[PDB]
């Protein structure tokens, strides 16, 4: 259901959005960089690896909708095979 160009673009999205967490974890007015990679990877893959609950509103406000990004992308997937 996907093309070659799709994977290499959604794949690079997780890391470019993961790094935004760390920048928002070292200027708070309790997340390490390694754990941030796990939390970003986990939600899309729907797997309970470690614990990646972040702190501060700004670092969290991205986490509000980041999980929702997993919804639409996966949702369209089942739509294709039906179609």
């Amino acid at each position: 259901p996907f093309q070659s160009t799709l994977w290499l673009l959604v794949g690079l999205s997780v890391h470019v959005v993961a790094v935004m967490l760390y920048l928002l974890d070292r200027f708070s007015p309790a997340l390490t960089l390694s754990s941030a990679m796990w939390f970003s990877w986990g939600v899309l893959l729907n797997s309970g690896i470690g614990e990646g609950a972040p702190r501060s509103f700004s670092a969290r406000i991205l986490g509000m909708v980041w999980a929702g990004f997993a919804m639409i992308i996966v949702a369209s997937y089942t739509a294709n095979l039906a179609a």
């Binding site: 007015p29 991205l62 909708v65």
Partner: peptide, 19 residues
């Protein structure tokens, strides 16, 4: 759009917390 609005919130929280 959300990540663009994310930065403003952090700045507003940081600036308000400064004073």
């Amino acid at each position: 759009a959300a990540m663009a609005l994310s930065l403003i919130t952090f700045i507003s929280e940081h600036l308000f917390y400064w004073q």
